[PDB]
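Researcher: Going back to the complex we discussed earlier. I've cleaned up the inputs and rechecked each line, so this should be the final set. Can you rerun the prediction on the complete assembly and write out the structure?
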Amino acid sequence: FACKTANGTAIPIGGGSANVYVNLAPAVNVGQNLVVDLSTQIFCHNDYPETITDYVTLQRGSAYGGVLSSFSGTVKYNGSSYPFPTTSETPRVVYNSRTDKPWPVALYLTPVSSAGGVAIKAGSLIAVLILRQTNNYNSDDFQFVWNIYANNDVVVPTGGCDVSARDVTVTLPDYPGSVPIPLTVYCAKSQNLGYYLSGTTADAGNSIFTNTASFSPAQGVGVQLTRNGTIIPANNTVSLGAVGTSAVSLGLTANYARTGGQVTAGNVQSIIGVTFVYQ
Amino acid sequence: ADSTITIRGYVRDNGCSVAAESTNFTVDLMENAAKQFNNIGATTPVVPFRILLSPCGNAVSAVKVGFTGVADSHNANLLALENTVSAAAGLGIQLLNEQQNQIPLNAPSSALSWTTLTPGKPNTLNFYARLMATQVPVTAGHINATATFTLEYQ
Amino acid sequence: ADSTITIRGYVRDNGCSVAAESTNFTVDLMENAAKQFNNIGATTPVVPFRILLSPCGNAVSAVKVGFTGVADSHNANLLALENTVSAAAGLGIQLLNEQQNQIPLNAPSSALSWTTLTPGKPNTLNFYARLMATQVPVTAGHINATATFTLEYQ
Amino acid sequence: GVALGATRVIYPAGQKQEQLAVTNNDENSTYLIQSWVENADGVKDGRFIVTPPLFAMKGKKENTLRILDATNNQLPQDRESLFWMNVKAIPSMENTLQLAIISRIKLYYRPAKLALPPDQAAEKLRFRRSANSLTLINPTPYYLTVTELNAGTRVLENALVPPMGESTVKLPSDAGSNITYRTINDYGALTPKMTGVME
Amino acid sequence: ADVTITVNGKVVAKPCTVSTTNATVDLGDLYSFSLMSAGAASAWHDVALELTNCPVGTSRVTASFSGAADSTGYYKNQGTAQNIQLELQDDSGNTLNTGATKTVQVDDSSQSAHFPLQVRALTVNGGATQGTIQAVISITYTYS
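Model: Rerun complete. Updated structure for the full complex:
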């Protein structure tokens, strides 16, 4: 039972542990969110199939690690789904051939938000998978751990919906104009969405976000967001109604708005957070 | 270029030059009998002198003519005679305007009054001079005195 | 060129203003006709005349007075009458002083004496004029004449 | 009535002219005024011009005669010279004697650069009492017109003492004792009384 | 938050409307006897430069003064009068000779700025002679 990654790196054999670097393509699906599909990333074969047959099982205690460690979901082992973290041993897969075949595992996550996400930077831990190996010649069995490491920056979805982008820069014209914000949202299944804004605000009505510009900042001016033609204050849920698999624009447009009196010339920057909710 | 201040005006000539005649001149009081000085304040007859002004500015209106010099120690309004052995004592020279009224020696601008003038034309400033008794009896002798005149224009 | 007015003149103790009264004769050929009282006729009602020294400066306390004119060919001290066809003959006008003594006609300044005057005050000098025969007989005719009085100041 | 401005005239050498005023105070009179200078001997020698030499005063008027030098520096430089200024008023027109008036005043020609000034000339006069007479001595270069000459209480005659010369008057011994005198200065005024110094 | 929006912008100062295109000072008639001595001057004459409708963003206007000067430094008289120059000041004792600049705050309430200036004639060396007084000070503004 010898395995290697998609990149061609041999996974060291033994009864200890091994760090296995793989590519993730997370995704929002209906009911569960795909975290990793190891069936395209890890490939295993039997060097001496004519004399011996290997069996590999996924042990209990296999779970997410690092920043994903607080989450739970399912594991799709050899066509069928089991709870994850695993609470019991899995049926075995047989390796009886020199031909490489996928390690048929795929980790999923139970949604806990609406459009939330979690950043996994490359080089860090995703999951700890306990494997047990047995053969058809003796009754020996040994265990080893595969630590699944991401080798690409990724955002694992945490809810039922996803967004066109998680960071969006927009540039206003040089006062007193406006620019439309390109930001759309879709859900794997039809949900009742709504979003609210957040950040530092200048006014009492909490509608105009303060100018945080660092170099040569203007004065008496801040940023204020609008949809259709209405001021959207912070911590005040706008409602998109019902959103399906087809993308829907939040309909936001950035504007200048006045805070203090004398409007000095200079630069204007404002960072605004958007958080999605079910209604 | 986008905005512009434009300044305007004239400098007008409101004064006159003293004519060559009058730059410096003399007044002859001639002989005066001693006996006519009956008490302090007695005065001889008036002797006319004048000051000619030419050329004159087109914006001249009036002048304040004044006379300065060493005043007499017994009357400040009179011009003192030179004190030599030969000179007459007990006297002082009085100076008068065209209407024969006193023009005090060393009088400041406020005390003096204006005299009308024709603009752009030559002007003649008429005056009178005469003696006045500060003491009696008046002692006889030479009469000698100088006095600077001054013009202040309006 | 600095606007100086120089003043000169004098105060002097003055002389006298002199006015001589012209003497008049009328007679009506009186004495003349009944004259021939020798060549020493020496009589007619004397006609007086004054010479007034007034006003007078405070100086004058003495003057030298004298008469001059065309003398009589017969008598040096008689003033010759006019010689015309109208005129009389055998007569020279005699000038007599205050004390009815004859005045030396045409006398020199050494001969004359000082007449004292009162300074400041007016002064009157008194004289008389009559006719004195120089030829017997006198004849009828005009008696006009002219003489010069002379005041010499000290 | 005709009057002169001065009782005498000083002519300083080098002067170009001297002035003498002539005044008629009578509104009704009209005179011919004829003026000229004579020397000490009473002769018209032409050392001085008078201008105008002849003019007519009509009524209350004043006119200033002007005496001009014509000597050309041919006079004594060491002392004063005596001339006589004459102003003759002839009334311009009955068996009448009509009079003309001559006013006659001293004209002193005064050379330049005399040591003694005029004011100090009076006090230099000295006397000489002898016989029945009194000589007056004048060491100054000025003609001294001595007046009010009192031999005690006895008032003697006036005198004109020549410059650098003498002059004698009559004197009664039957008279006062101490001498006092006065002079007529350049402007016609009397100088103060001075004590008669003898010898 | 689920998404972060960064909005970038800029406030640029822009030109106002200049009301006073042609300011006119008239000193009237001055008099030689008064302008005789060195440092003699006429009475000050207030002149106002007015800029209105100042766009938001523009908080200051800077005036820049130009004109033909003479050896005294002040503005040359183009008129016939001699020994006479023109002086321009603010209202704080600062001479605005050719080349100098003055800055004022834009009044936010009125959306406009004004320069309070004063002008007089003067004679540095004295002896101001008869003649006309003519001078034109050109002025342009920058905005910030």
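Model: Worth noting: The longest strand of chain A covers residues 266-278.
Researcher: Good, that matches what I expected from the previous run.
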